[PDB]
Write a protein that binds this ligand. Sequence first.
Ligand SMILES: *[C@@H]1O[C@H](CO)[C@@H](O)[C@H](O)[C@H]1NC(C)=O
Lengths: 48, 48
Amino acid sequence: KNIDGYFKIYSKHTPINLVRDLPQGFSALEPLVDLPIGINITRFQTLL
Amino acid sequence: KNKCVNFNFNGLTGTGVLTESNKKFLPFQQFGRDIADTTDAVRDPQTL
Ligand SMILES: *[C@@H]1O[C@H](CO)[C@@H](O)[C@H](O)[C@H]1NC(C)=O
């Protein structure tokens, strides 16, 4: 989330055993990064 | 420690007695709060 030009990045890694979709349940994501880019973001893309 | 002091941690001001905690702050955390919205515990900027 980019708020007031703040790029806040939270994340979480968890082991899973499922090939269908998101496992049903609950787990919280801890903050990792806050970048002061001051840059408006309207779109994004993924790279594999 | 173990004395009444006027403490200022990175601008977080208050008055109290500083004692060794048994709390488990997460890697990103700086200071705790109480139900009253008062600082209950802190992390030293110079020592983790
Ligand atoms: C949004 O764009 C404007 C362009 O004037 C800029 O001043 C502002 O800092 C930007 N804010 C964010 C959310 O990065």
